[PDB]
Amino acid sequence: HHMLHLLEQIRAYCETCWEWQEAHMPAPVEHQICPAVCVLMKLSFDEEHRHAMNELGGLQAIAELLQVDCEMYGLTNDHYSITLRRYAGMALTNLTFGDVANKATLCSMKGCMRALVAQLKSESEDLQQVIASVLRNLSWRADVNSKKTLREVGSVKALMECALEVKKESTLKSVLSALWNLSAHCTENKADICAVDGALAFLVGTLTYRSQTNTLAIIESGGGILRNVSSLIATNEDHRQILRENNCLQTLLQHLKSHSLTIVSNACGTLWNLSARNPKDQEALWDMGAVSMLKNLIHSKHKMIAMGSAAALRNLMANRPAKYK
C-alpha cells in the first residue's frame, strides 16, 4: 500500500509529461518526484520489497520516469535531473539483478534502452557508473532477443568510447564489467570493441592498472574482455601490432604468476588464441620464456587454467623456431 502510493506519484508525473510531449513543460521538483524515487531506490535492495514492486509494475514505472526525463531535458548538468536519473537507475539495477523476466522487460522497452545508452556521454561519472551497472545485469544471462536488442541500441561501442574518458575507479569497474559480459555474447560484439579507435591500447593498459584500493577488479575485467576478443585479434595482423607496441605478451606472462585465479585464467585464454597461426608472436613467446611458465600451470586443479596453459603450450611446442636446436 505504501509502495503503491509512491509508484502512483511517478506514474501520475509520467502521464503529465506525455500530455506535454503530445502537445509541444512540467518540472519534477514541483511534483515531489526525486524524494519518492529515492525511497524506492532504497526499498529495491530488499528481496521481499522487490517482489512487491514486480506485482505492482514497479520496473515499468521507474524505467519510464528515467526514459521521459532523458527525452525532455537531454544531457543536462542540472542536479535535480541527474540525481533523479541516478536513483532511478540504481533501482533498475537491483530489479534486474537475478530476474530473467525483468531483464527481458527492460530490454523490450526500446525507448528506455536508447535513453540509457545516451547517458554514458554525460559529465557526471557517477551517472556513468549507474548506467553501466544496469547494462551489466542486462548483459548477464541475456535471452536471444535481449542480446539482439543490446547490439541494436549500440551499448558496446558506447561503453568502450565511455571507458577511455573515465577517471574514477568505481565508474571504470562497472563499464568494464558490462563490456566483459557483452563481449561473450557473439563474434560481432567482439568486433565492435576492437573497431573503436584506441580501444585495444586501453585494454592492454588495464593489465598493469595501479589500483587505489587493494583490489584486482580492473585487471580481471580488462583482461577478461581481452580474453574474449583475442580470437578475433588472432586472425588479424593490425590488431596484433597494437598489442606488441604496448607490450601485451610480456605482460600476460607476468599475469601467470598472479595469485588471482581469474587473472591466470584470463591470461591462459588470451595466450591460447594469440599463440596460433602467427610465427612472429610464437618466436616472441619462446624468447620471453612462455614454455617454462606454461609448463608449471598444466597440472593445475582448475579446468580452464589447465586447458588454456596446455593448449597454448601445444601451439608453441608444435612450432619451434629455427634458432632453437
Binding site: 540504481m90 539495477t93 551497472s133 562497472s174 558490462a178 566483459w180
Partner: peptide
C-alpha cells in the same frame, strides 16, 4: 563479470 546489486 557476472551480475550484481548496485555498487554503493
Amino acid at each position: 563479470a557476472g551480475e550484481s546489486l548496485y555498487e554503493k
